[PDB]
Enzyme design. Sequence first.
Site: not given
Lengths: 228, 212, 219, 195, 195, 196, 196, 222, 204
Positions: G1-2, G33, G129
């Site tokens: 995930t960013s 998200k 991450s």
Amino acid sequence: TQQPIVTGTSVISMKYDNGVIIAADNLGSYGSLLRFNGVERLIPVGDNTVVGISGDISDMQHIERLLKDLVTENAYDNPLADAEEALEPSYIFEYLATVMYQRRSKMNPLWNAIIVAGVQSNGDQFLRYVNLLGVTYSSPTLATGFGAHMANPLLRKVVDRESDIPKTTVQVAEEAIVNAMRVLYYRDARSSRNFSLAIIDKNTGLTFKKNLQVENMKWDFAKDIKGY
Amino acid sequence: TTTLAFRFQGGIIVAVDSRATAGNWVASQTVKKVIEINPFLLGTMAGGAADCQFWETWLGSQCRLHELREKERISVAAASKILSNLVYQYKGAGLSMGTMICGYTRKEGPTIYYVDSDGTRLKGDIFCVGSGQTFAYGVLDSNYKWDLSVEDALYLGKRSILAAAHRDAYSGGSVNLYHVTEDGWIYHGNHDVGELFWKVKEEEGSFNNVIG
Amino acid sequence: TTIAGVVYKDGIVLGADTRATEGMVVADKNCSKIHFISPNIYCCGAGTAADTDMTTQLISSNLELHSLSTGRLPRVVTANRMLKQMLFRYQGYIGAALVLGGVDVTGPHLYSIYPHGSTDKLPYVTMGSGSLAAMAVFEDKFRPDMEEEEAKNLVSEAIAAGIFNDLGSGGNIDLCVISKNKLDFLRPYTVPNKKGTRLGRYRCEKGTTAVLTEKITPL
Amino acid sequence: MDIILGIRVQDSVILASSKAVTRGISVLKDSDDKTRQLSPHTLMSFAGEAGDTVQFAEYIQANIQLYSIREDYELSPQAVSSFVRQELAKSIRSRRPYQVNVLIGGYDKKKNKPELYQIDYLGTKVELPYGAHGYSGFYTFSLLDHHYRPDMTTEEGLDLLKLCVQELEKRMPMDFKGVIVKIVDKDGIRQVDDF
Amino acid sequence: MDIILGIRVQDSVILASSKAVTRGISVLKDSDDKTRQLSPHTLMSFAGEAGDTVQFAEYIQANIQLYSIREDYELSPQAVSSFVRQELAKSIRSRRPYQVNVLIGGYDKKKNKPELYQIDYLGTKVELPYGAHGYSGFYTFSLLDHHYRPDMTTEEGLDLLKLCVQELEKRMPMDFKGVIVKIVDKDGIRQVDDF
Amino acid sequence: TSIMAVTFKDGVILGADSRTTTGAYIANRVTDKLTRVHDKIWCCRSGSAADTQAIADIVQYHLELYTSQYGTPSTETAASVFKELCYENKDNLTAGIIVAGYDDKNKGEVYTIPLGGSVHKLPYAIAGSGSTFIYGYCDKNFRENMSKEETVDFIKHSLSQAIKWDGSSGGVIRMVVLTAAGVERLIFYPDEYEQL
Amino acid sequence: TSIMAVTFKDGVILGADSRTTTGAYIANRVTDKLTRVHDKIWCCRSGSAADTQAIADIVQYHLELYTSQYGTPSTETAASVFKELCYENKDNLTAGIIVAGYDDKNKGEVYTIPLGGSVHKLPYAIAGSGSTFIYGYCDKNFRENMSKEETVDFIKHSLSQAIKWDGSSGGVIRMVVLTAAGVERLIFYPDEYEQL
Amino acid sequence: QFNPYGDNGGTILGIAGEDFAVLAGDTRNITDYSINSRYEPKVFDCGDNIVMSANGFAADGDALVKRFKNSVKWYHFDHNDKKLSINSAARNIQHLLYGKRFFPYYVHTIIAGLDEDGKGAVYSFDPVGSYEREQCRAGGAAASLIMPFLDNQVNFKNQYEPGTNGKVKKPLKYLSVEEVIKLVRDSFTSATERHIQVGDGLEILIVTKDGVRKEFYELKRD
Amino acid sequence: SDPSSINGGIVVAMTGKDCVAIACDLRLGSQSLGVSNKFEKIFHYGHVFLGITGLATDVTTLNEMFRYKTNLYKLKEERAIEPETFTQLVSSSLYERRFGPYFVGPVVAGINSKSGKPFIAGFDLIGCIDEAKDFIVSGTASDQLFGMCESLYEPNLEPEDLFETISQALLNAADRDALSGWGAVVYIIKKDEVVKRYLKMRQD
Ligand SMILES: *[C@@H](CS(C)(=O)=O)[C@H](Cc1ccc(CN)cc1)NC(=O)[C@H](CO)NC(=O)[C@H](CC(C)C)NC(=O)[C@H](Cc1ccccc1)N=[N+]=[N-]
Ligand SMILES: *[C@@H](CS(C)(=O)=O)[C@H](Cc1ccc(CN)cc1)NC(=O)[C@H](CO)NC(=O)[C@H](CC(C)C)NC(=O)[C@H](Cc1ccccc1)N=[N+]=[N-]
Ligand SMILES: [Mg+2]
Ligand SMILES: [Mg+2]
Ligand SMILES: [Mg+2]
Ligand SMILES: [Mg+2]
Ligand SMILES: [Mg+2]
């Protein structure tokens, strides 16, 4: 049981003739990642006490709210809240010490080391430590975590015993503290250049200094290093 | 630790050593391992020092409440079962307790109950408990009979602790003696092993494994 | 243990405390920790004490044989290599933590050697349980190209910091000053603590102890 | 394995060794002789790990018998005990150590004295008036401390030993099926058949 | 604890239970009676974890005696066994289960029949002509398979039981110090003193 | 540790921070992680100090013996010797090495050798714990055939950021410039790079 | 995930990738998200999908009940409710949430709440991450008081790099723009962002 | 995993005379190889001529002292200002300790004072409440160094009358307060020499019928 | 299963005026069980005395090993080994087994026959030499011995005085240790006479 995630490093402090000095850097580490560069870890309570906190930052913020809430509660039904019945350093410390030991005794500690620095009603210097285990102690100099190993040796050369406290001025004491913060920046991997310092004097009151920096840094000898 | 108690013609003998250890560290050599519950009741202490001292002192309080409530001396059977039912409630929590509840009443005569921290409760004529029990059993079993006089029974109990005090590393210091009869218990002295050993060696001609 | 070294203008100043411990117990209060490697090279020792003594003795022996063969004074780099390569081969199991200092044909040199076989070449170093206390003194007051009596004072001050603030360190302060013109082995340099005076005489009078038998044999 | 005892009296060394060989929940044998004659006046009893015990005993026996043939001479009990100790002391730092405890009873013909040596699997040797290996000692040592005298006869020693076996049969948890008793004196080694 | 046996013959149930109480390397007692009378014609023997055994036995005894007083009536052996099973079956899923194995020997006066129930600590109940708990069964069951007949007398049952004790005394590793034997029949419960 | 090597028009530049740590204590704040295995073949060291020091010494020995017999080794050859040591002793080593050298035929070359002992020839390479924080930056800012001054700035800005975020990195920024002209050593202090 | 949120002149923009994984399998390549807890208070979710979904739902409920009684909650208040849940249940949660909202008094605000449940008010925040790879880039390229188009580009370039290096990130780049004008949803596909 | 215990070092010592009792302790407080304080007292006047020290884990020590001090206060409130005798204090401390049997107070407790006959009294407790009255007791880190010396000098252990062949022991006797303080000071200087956790300063609390007096002496700071 | 505390035992050595003393207890046990009350821990090779505490099989082995080595020494050197030299031999021999050591605590004592100087030394299990002017201690009651020696010891004691000091140090230390005691031996060593005395002590 938990593990500390976002953390603060050393808090250092000492007594001098008229009061106490306390200092801590402005970093919130996330393991090796130097994540947050603007964290204030010295938290003043009234005009006579500063609580310096190291360790878990989420637990520090919880303690910050407990102290803020303590000030509100003391003011209730208290006409002398800004005078004879104001919060003392010794009251604020004993509260925290009680909490810290209660929390360790339920196997759910607040993951911190705390120094409460201040001046009492009668002009006496107050300086005392408490940690996640509820262990408490006082000394002319106190330092948490990394500062215990490097700051205390330097600060003890200024005040080695009780009898050296009246002989130590505020200028000599502040120099020593700022000097110790430089040494910690060279050698502590989880520290930062930017720090806060707080003097609590019986005459001049509470002086809170923000955005200080480590300076006079000796790096020149580095050019002459060739291999191992 | 070595504790013993046995039944014979003229009552009950109770003998204990006086050593307390924290591993190999001899912490004390002047320890009380017999608890005087009432003029007719004695308790011996083996295993954990705190666990025994605490719960056998507590036992004396419960025995006192019985005789207030019931206007009658508590039976040895009942006294021992208060303690055994108590430890059984704490079973698995890690209490360490090896004890003997010794006493006389008109109802049952001289009686000994072995009680331990894992719940076992046993009536019997001879018991030895502690890290030196085997050494005490060895001397006691081989010289025992109902016949025995009070003088000889006191000595055998003394001698059986001495035996274990010598061989067992964690037993020693001194020997505390007790004689329990129909009239109650009688203390028969504290006998330092330092002096007793050499006296028993000389007078009895035993302990020939020793230089002296 | 607190051991330390600095490079000064004319050469090298090594320093050490004198406390030897067995767990929490002090076994020797005046124990020597600065070891001879060659006439121009000495070695302060921390970590496992047997490993320190035997590693410096072995490399001192091999350097003596090397120097007899070549007919010239040994260098610090060869002392460094021989210690390093050996310690690496034993993958840290030889727990020798050394401060190696000496003066060559190529000038003064100072090294810190670790148990796993890593070395750092530096103008000042500290090792042992009291390294942080000692390093604080060096970070406070060190500068390059110090005079002799100044460098002596700085190292002494750094060992003292270890003595007082670290429980693993104690006793006297030993120095070793190495330059081209001299070697000064100062033991003790300073006695910072007086031995505690006893107020009573507890020694027993003659005949007090109980004896069983006696035997006398002449030589 | 399990019970091995030894008593040195005025003129002889007596060894008593349990007869049971148990594996799991079955007593496989009740007549096992846990002993080897090393020389005419030296006897070794043994207890410990299955297999290891007999293998070690017989290995020692072969070596002493080899020595006897080579020198046409019987090694002293002291000498045999020192040889045995060293073999165990080597063994303890091997890849797979012998887990065997032994008693060596011998009559030294040069000194005209009985001798009893207790040696554990580590190679810990002591000369003793009486000895035991394993849990046996916890009952017997205190008993022998009381009843043993250094001037006893072989008959007095056997009665003293009966007292030990009786105490072990009363207080030990396991059925060891009695003992085989052997006497070592000036005339050599003989077995008491009725014990 | 350790050995508990049971044999149901024509007119009686016979229970045999070992006398030893061992803790560590010491036999603390050699006369222990591992049984409780639950009612005049019902007997329960027990083996298992120290403390738990007597505590469970006496608890069951109190409950059956309470029932007897309340109803002025003796519960059948089947009824008592089902009560006991359920108590153990509850116990096995408690915070600390009773580690106790039992045999229940009873004479049903309404049926005029002896009955033997084997129940383990899990609450596993079976009615059997002969039963055992622990390692005992490994020797006795095959022996009884051979020698047992359903029409035997109480005397024949006692001889059959002697044969079991003899085999256990020969092949079991531990000294269990003999057995206390009790007979349950139409006239109640009695102890055989010479076994 | 934050290390990198970058090829450019006139050759190649290596860069490194100067921090060595045991946990959170800085054992050496002035470390030299850029080490000479030949006149114009150098390496950046990351991982275990003891392992990388021992490897670099063995490689320097190998290349000295190569030179005695066959003259100047290629940068590829130096990388192959590093690989051979790293790959065959993978189970006992913690070494992340970047190899950088200047030939006159091949110009500047960079080989990276990660933990497994694989070899990767690249225009530029980053490694060490601090490299994670500059992947984004370096990919966006690297261009081929940069000048000396541009490449010095690229390394200085990159390691500046790596140092800023990584606690295991810091001290001075050391650099080594490898060209036909020779070997140049550069140093940059905190008071310069921190305020970039 | 960013994930990230960035304050600018007219308010605040939130950004996220669309990849969810179980190990190396992509369970959902089109994940959202960025989730609404109030009209103009939104959050970016990282960590356990189940934990962050459960937290966001509880917060949305809390703020709906706040609104019923006391009118529109401040962004600070929303962050405090997130913190309270994250801090008090730290032992049972894996949630890294960025909270972003638009007031008319306070304009755009960003609060980040890492694993411990501490709160940090910042000009912009990055998390997940993939954030590790863009610390260097984002610190070098963020300016205060950017325009809408500049801030969209800053987020697009940043998440582009985070996606490029992080295997746990990918798919589309979703954004949510929070201003006085209203709420705008933006999407950017691989064929655009990959070749930036 | 979180460990709720720590070790703060230090050592304590209690001796009882005929009409007095002393309870001494060093003033050094430590964790691992660091000094927290050179002067942190751990021997306390608790009222009613009872002095107390709970050495080991200082957080547990402070908690216990705090609870016992409070116990004395409530004893006065509930029993008409009656003086808490040393034997009653001891029994009360057993219950404080045994109340945490399954999460102990990591300390060795010692109390000193005068019994109801005016004679000197020392009581020592294990961490879970086993207790005893004794003449002599050293506790803490250096107990193993100090205690065998006390046996030899206070109780004259192992010593016989010269020329008597080890047949006549030395007659025990009461020591004066001067003699006892000599033994305390020498016990602590010896302990300071050979134990790393012991040093900085020594604080002795002396208890007579006239109250509680203090004496302080420097100890080696290395 | 800690090899250095299975069997138990202690050794202590002191220096005096032109003399040295070395003492040891007589116990050998197996954990709690006392096995032998005749197990001496002090040996000698010419005029050099060696005491050894720790695992009893290693005590015996090392005695046998140093007897071997000092016998060969004397044959080749044509003189008795001196304490300073023997101390070095002990250190070398122990460090030879660096990663599989003997679990022992040896103590050297003696008077150099050339210089007349009293000499004592101690070692850890791995060979590290500890030299001392005053006293060396070893064994399961080493803490107790350290405390006794540090308070009882003074310099330059006459042989008869030194005997009282070392004996009281050993006895009172042994009585605070479960695994030490069961008898004691003291060696008083002068330039050309050695006196060996057995002490009366409590047997528990
Ligand atoms: C012998 C029994 S044994 C060796 O066969 O297990 C004695 C019996 C005994 C001694 C004393 C008393 C009454 N005062 C009654 C019976 N038992 C002991 O000596 C036990 C050994 O198990 N010792 C202790 O219980 C000691 C007593 C101290 C005075 C030395 N205490 C401890 O062992 C505790 C353990 C502990 C508990 C909590 C936290 C830390 C440690 N203290 N310590 N160490
Ligand atoms: C200080 C180093 S430190 C505490 O900072 O790590 C000293 C350095 C030193 C002292 C003396 C000499 C002599 N030339 C050289 C260096 N180190 C010590 O005091 C160590 C503490 O770790 N002490 C020892 O190594 C002692 C030697 C004493 C007898 C004097 N030995 C032990 O403690 C052994 C170590 C050991 C080794 C292998 C396996 C198990 C244990 N313990 N024992 N037994
Ligand atoms: Mg004993
Ligand atoms: Mg390695
Ligand atoms: Mg940094
Ligand atoms: Mg000290
Ligand atoms: Mg003893």
